[PDB]
């Protein structure tokens, strides 16, 4: 099975590409507590159809660029700008950790 993941488009700045943040969760190997973790995937959108906020599925794919190995299978639901806020703030916090 070509791996199908699902997450949230958090960038459309590139041409024919969307960035998709994808959550995965699981027990911690020692401490057992279920923990979330995530990862961004660059996904191929040949028709710049998908935009900021969309939940999409993402599918394992024949390579399209360096580090672009996924295509956008389908829209799951639109909207979710809340989740994009989540990401964008987490991102600007970074500048408040320097010297």
């Amino acid at each position: 099975p070509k791996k199908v993941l699902t997450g949230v488009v958090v960038s459309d700045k590139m041409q024919k590409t969307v960035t998709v943040l994808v959550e995965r969760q699981f027990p911690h190997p020692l401490y057992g507590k279920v923990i979330k973790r995530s990862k961004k995937y660059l996904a191929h959108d040949p028709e710049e159809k998908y935009k900021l906020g969309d939940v999409v599925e993402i599918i394992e794919s024949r390579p399209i660029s360096k580090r672009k190995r996924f295509r956008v299978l389908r829209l799951v639901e639109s909207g979710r700008m809340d989740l994009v806020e989540k990401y964008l703030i987490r991102r600007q916090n970074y500048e408040s950790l320097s010297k």
């Binding site: 401490y31 057992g32 507590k33 279920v34």
Partner: protein, 138 residues
């Protein structure tokens, strides 16, 4: 805000029993009721019942002890010697049926929430299921 109502319930019991109270109320929840049912069936409590306290749903819970004892300190033996959450908000604990534990060589229970309802270890093992390991009582 009360993070774990089940831990709350359990602890209300732990506490009331340690001073030989005849009963405790505990704010009512369907889930809570199901755990009590087991508790009652297994003879840890006398029984329980729905009630309103300031017109709000509780579960009065009739506790149960040994007989009076002999020498100095004639306080009754306790029926609930031990009662203790396992799975908790901070850290859920889930088990397959092959790893449901034997509580005090079976002289003790483990209550256990499954997709075939809340069950003791034995009920659930025979029913061939596991799930969230709620608490162990001996």
């Amino acid at each position: 805000m009360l993070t774990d109502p089940i831990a709350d319930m359990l602890t209300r019991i732990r506490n009331a029993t340690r001073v030989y109270k005849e009963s405790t109320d505990v704010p009512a929840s369907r889930f809570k009721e199901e755990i009590l049912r087991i508790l009652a069936r297994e003879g840890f409590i006398k029984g329980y019942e729905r009630v309103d306290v300031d017109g709000k749903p509780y579960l009065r819970v009739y506790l149960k002890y040994g007989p009076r004892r002999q020498g100095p300190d004639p306080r009754p033996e306790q029926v609930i010697h031990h009662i203790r959450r396992i799975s908790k908000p901070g850290r859920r604990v889930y088990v397959g049926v092959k790893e449901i534990p034997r509580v005090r060589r079976g002289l003790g229970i483990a209550i256990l929430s499954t997709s075939k309802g809340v069950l003791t270890d034995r009920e659930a093992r025979k029913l061939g299921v596991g799930g969230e390991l709620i608490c162990e009582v001996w």
